Amino acid sequence: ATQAPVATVEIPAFFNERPAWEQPPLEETLYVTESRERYDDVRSGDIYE
Amino acid sequence: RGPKLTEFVGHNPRNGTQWRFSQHSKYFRIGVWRETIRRNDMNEGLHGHSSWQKSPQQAVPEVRLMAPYP
């Protein structure tokens, strides 16, 4: 089944999170994560990489 | 294990060589890229005349084509 949505909510990020082991170790300090938008065009593929 | 599958790349069996041109050729890399990403559709190209093939079985020489268990 090509799963498709019934709703959207801007819930906080801790609800469905990659668990504390499935993610790398502490990322406030060692790996700054930023989801920025690509300047190059993307047709398929998110705009916020 | 049977008699080898004997292809040639050349003019003859005695002139050309046993070996197809490996995946690294300039002509094969688009075909290998496709046969990688769209692995379930059939892709045009020269990627077949290469040694690297989509199948688990690569066209590396002295393949025993009548083997009981390949």
């Binding site: - | 005695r14 060589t17 688009i30 890229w33």
Partner: protein, 83 residues
């Protein structure tokens, strides 16, 4: 015999031949017929008794077999006498 405890950081790949090709987006030559049309001169495998002063064929086969046994780790932990 003839030992010196050297080190090595980058070995080659496994020369299995089937190392991925460096992928490219476009081709510098967009002509595919050139792979289908390329003739060459003949590869006469034996000229007379194929004798050559250096052992040009046996030597190269031995030097390919040597390093391939090396990489295959002599190729016997896979199976030798499971039968």
């Amino acid at each position: 015999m003839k030992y010196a405890d050297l080190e090595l950081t980058t070995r080659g790949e496994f020369p299995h031949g089937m190392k991925e090709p460096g992928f490219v987006k476009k081709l510098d030559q967009n002509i595919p017929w050139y792979f289908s049309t390329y003739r060459s001169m003949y590869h006469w495998p034996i000229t007379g008794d194929n004798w050559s002063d250096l052992n040009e064929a046996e030597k190269h086969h031995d030097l390919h077999m040597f390093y391939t046994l090396a990489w295959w780790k002599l190729g016997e932990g896979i199976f030798d006498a499971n039968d």
